[PDB]
Design a protein around this nucleic acid. Sequence first.
DNA 1: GTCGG
DNA 2: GCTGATGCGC
DNA 3: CCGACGGCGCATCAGC
Length: 317
Amino acid sequence: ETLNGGITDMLTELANFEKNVSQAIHKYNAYRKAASVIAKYPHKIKSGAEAKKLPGVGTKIAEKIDEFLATGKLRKLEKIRQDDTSSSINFLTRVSGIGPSAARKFVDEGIKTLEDLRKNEDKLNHHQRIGLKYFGDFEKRIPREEMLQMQDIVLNEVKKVDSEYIATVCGSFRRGAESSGDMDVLLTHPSFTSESQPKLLHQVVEQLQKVHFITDTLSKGETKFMGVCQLPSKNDEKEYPHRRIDIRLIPKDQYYCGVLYFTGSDIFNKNMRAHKGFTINEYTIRPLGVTGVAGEPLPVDSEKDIFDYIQWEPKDR
DNA sequence: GTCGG
DNA sequence: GCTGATGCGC
DNA sequence: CCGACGGCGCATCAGC
Ligand SMILES: *P(=O)(O)OC[C@@H]1O[C@H](n2ccc(N)nc2=O)CS1
Ligand code: NA
Ligand code: NA
Ligand code: NA
Ligand code: NA
Ligand code: NA
């Protein structure tokens, strides 16, 4: 599955410059679509024309592939990689909270590196400071073992605040994956429905700060919390990395739609979405009509009440 | 940049 | 001060 | 040729 990796690296490299430097998000997704269709292609590509056959690979990406195969490089990438301005803008967006627009502004003012960021705490907002502070940790994957320990803590403390909460760690983790990029937790409580927040999210966040699991807050409102956490390590062991954790308060009757959605995979979702006359979003499933007019959303008490309706487990996905 | 109305 | 627009992460 | 390409919660900015 690494058979066109040079081609795939190139395309992802091009993708990020469109996103972070050119600010062309559709070009970004075009290069990424092209990269992943190629990454799944079971042969070593020999020509751009061979690749052009795949959906998401067009004439310009096929030309690029021909230049890359003939020379092992792309003049445009070589060039843009040398460029002080653009390289810097690209790199700074790796800090969580620095998007393409903040990156450009910093580089305009001569702030180009992490050091530069450090020397100017004042010019960054809260999220950006936390992303700087944990820059290295956030780029690390989380082994399954550590996620299990993190899960242990979350369920214990959620249940302790109130035994009637229901919390589920979603993401790749729930799919059995050997590692994860962060922790996505979905939270509900029987007294929170589509027509209902009484500090339900807040008092959970607070409990996990109280036992020193949550260490920082990127953002926090009534339904979505974004922050940082860390496992305790014993007296004379090296610290675990700081880790990203999100917690979502969803109403009881949308939980399982939410669960499914944040369970992923992104691939299987977009897939089963289009796959019959039903439409699905993170919240609900609605039946259509003639034009395609969504009727009222259907009740749900489980994940598998949804595997009724298209005639369609997380292990697989 | 690629697709498709 | 308040409303809506934009930036951002995912 | 020429528009679609994803949408939503929170923080923060621009404007009144
Ligand atoms: P994060 O990287 O934790 O992804 C998990 C969930 O998937 C959904 N998702 C992923 C990527 C993007 N671009 N958009 C998106 O909605 C929601 S968070
Ligand atoms: Na641009
Ligand atoms: Na094609
Ligand atoms: Na960023
Ligand atoms: Na995730
Ligand atoms: Na992730």
